[PDB]
C-alpha cells in the first residue's frame with residue numbers, strides 16, 4: 001500500500017474498476033493520473049449507452065451539434081489553428097538519430113523529425129504535469145485489426161477529450177471485449193491531452209479546447225509509447241491511426257518482417273467472374289478514398305472496399321502477399337464528395353457519422369464545396385466558422401481538410417472479407433500523386449527493383465492534409481513522407497528484400513496520374529468512376545495480356561488497349577506524352593534528393609535503377 005492516500009485513484013473512478021484492469025494497464029492509468037491530475041477517471045466499455053452519454057454530454061457543453069436532417073449524425077467545429085496534421089511538430093525519439101532518419105549529406109532531413117530522449121524529457125515535463133486538472137481522463141481500450149485475431153495490435157489511449165473517445169469508437173474496435181482479449185499481454189501506450197487544464201486561463205474558440213503553441217506529437221518506438229499534447233484534430237489525437245498504425249507499426253513491421261503502409265485495399269471483379277485485390281499508395285488528399293469506394297462506369301465491373309487509408313501486409317506460407325485493413329471506419333475528406341464523384345460515400349455518411357468543420361444548413365444538413373447539390377428555397381448556410389455564409393463571399397463554407405468520420409460496416413460496397421483475419425491476397429500495387437505536368441496517365445514497372453524505385457521517386461502537389469501551402473511539388477516517397485517510423489534508407493532495403501523471399505508471388509507495380517493538366521489548366525482525364533478504365537488495363541496486365549508497349553519510363557498501354565469508348569474527346573497524345581526535356585529534369589531532381597536525403601543509407605539497387613533510368617532517357 002501507501003503511507004497516505006497517495007496513489008490509489010479508485011475514489012475518482014466514475015465508470016469501471018481499476019481492480020478489473022490488467023496489472024500493467026492499471027499502472028499505466030494510475031501513473032499518468034498521478035501526473036496529469038484528472039478530476040475523474042472513466043474506463044470506456046464501448047457500449048451504446050456510453051456513446052449516448054458522451055454525445056449528450058458534448059452537446060450540453062457546446063462541443064457538438066445534432067444534425068437533425070440525418071440519423072444520429074453530429075457536427076463539431078474546431079479552433080481554426082487545430083485543423084490538420086503538423087508535420088513540423090511530429091517527432092520520433094530514438095537513442096541514435098540514424099535509427100529515425102538517414103543523416104543527410106548537406107541539408108536538413110525531410111524524412112522525419114528526430115528528437116533526443118533528453119530533449120523530449122524537458123518538453124514532456126513542461127506540458128503534462130497537471131494538464132488534466134478539472135477534466136475526466138477517459139481510458140480507451142482499442143484493437144487495431146479484427147478483435148481476437150492473432151495479427152491485431154492492442155493499445156490503451158488516455159485522453160481528456162470526449163470528442164476523441166467518440167471518434168475512436170468509430171475508427172477502431174473499442175471497449176470491454178478488447179481488455180478481455182489483451183489479458184496480461186503487450187499493448188501500445190497512448191497518452192493524449194488537449195492541454196487546457198481548468199480553470200481556463202485563455203478563452204476557447206468555438207468551444208474547442210486545444211493548445212497550439214505547445215502542440216507536440218511524439219513517438220517512442222523503443223518504449224512502445226505515443227505521447228500527444230495540445231491538438232484535437234483526428235490525425236494528432238486518434239493515436240491508433242497515423243501514430244500507431246503507420247509510424248510505430250512501420251518499425252515493428254521492419255523488426256518482424258511485414259509492412260505497414262499508407263494504402264487503400266480494394267477488390268475488383270470483372271465481367272468473367274474473376275476477382276483480384278489491389279493496394280494503392282497516394283499521398284494525403286490525393287484520391288485513395290475515392291478510388292477505394294469507386295462506382296465504375298464500365299458495365300460488368302464491380303469494386304468493393306476493404307480499406308481506404310492503412311494496410312498491414314505480410315507474405316504467407318504459400319508466397320501470397322496478404323493485406324488487412326486495421327481500421328474500423330473511414331476518416332475521409334468531405335469537400336469534393338458528391339453523388340457524381342463518390343456516391344458510395346454519400347450513402348455511407350447519412351447515419352451514425354461525426355462531421356468536423358463542414359457547413360450546416362438551416363434544415364439540419366451538411367454542406368461543403370463540390371457537394372454539387374442545390375438547396376431548396378429558404379434554406380440558409382452556416383459556415384464552419386459558425387458564421388452566416390453566402391455563396392458569394394471568398395471564404396469557403398467548409399474547411400478544405402474537413403472530414404467525416406463514419407463506420408466502415410455501413411459502406412454499401414464493403415468487401416465481404418474486410419474483417420477476415422487471414423487478409424486478402426494482393427496482386428498489384430499502385431503508386432501516384434498530383435502531377436500537373438509530364439507524368440502520363442499510367443505506366444507499369446519493369447521489375448520489382450524498378451517498382452521500388454518508382455515508389456521512392458514519387459512527387460506530388462502539396463495538399464491541405466498538413467501545414468504545407470503553395471501547391472508546390474514535393475517529394476513523398478511511397479506516400480509515406482509524414483509517416484516513416486524509421487530510417488527511410490532501411491525502409492527501401494526492407495522493400496527490396498521481399499524479392500529474396502522463397503516462393504514470393506510479387507505483385508505488379510503501377511504508377512498513375514489522374515491530375516495531368518493541359519495548356520488551359522483543366523484536367524485531361526475525368527477521373528473518379530472513369531478510373532475503372534485504367535483498372536481494367538491493370539487487371540489484364542496481371543493476367544498476362546499482351547497489351548503494353550515498352551518506353552523509357554516503363555510499360556504503357558498499346559494504342560486501343562484502353563477502353564476509351566464514351567469519352568471520345570480525350571486527348572490521348574498529351575495524356576501519354578513522354579518528353580525528354582521533362583524527364584531529364586525529373587531524374588536530376590530525383591538524383592539530388594536521394595543523394596542528399598538518403599546519402600549513405602541508399603541501397604545500391606535503388607542507385608542502379610536511377611542510373612538505368614538516366615541512361616534510357618539520354619538515349620531518347
Ligand SMILES: Nc1nc2c(ncn2[C@@H]2O[C@H](COP(=O)(O)OP(=O)(O)OP(=O)(O)O)[C@@H](O)[C@H]2O)c(=O)[nH]1
Pocket residue numbers: 282283284285286287288289290291308309331332333334335336337341465514515523526527528531
Ligand atoms: N480530379 C480528380 N480529383 C480527385 C480524384 N479522386 C479524388 N479526387 C479529389 O481529391 C480529394 C482527396 O481525395 P481522397 O480520396 O479523400 O484523398 P485520400 O487519398 O483518401 O486522402 P487522405 O484521407 O488524407 O489519406 C477529394 O476532394 C477528391 O474529390 C480523381 O480521380 N480526379
Ligand SMILES: O=C([O-])C(=O)[O-]
Pocket residue numbers: 085235283284285309331465466
Ligand atoms: O488523415 C489522413 O488520412 C492523411 O492525412 O493522410
Ligand SMILES: [Mn+2]
Pocket residue numbers: 262284285309
Ligand atoms: Mn491518409
Ligand SMILES: [Mn+2]
Pocket residue numbers: 288289308309331332333
Ligand atoms: Mn482517405
Ligand SMILES: [Mn+2]
Pocket residue numbers: 496497499605
Ligand atoms: Mn536484391
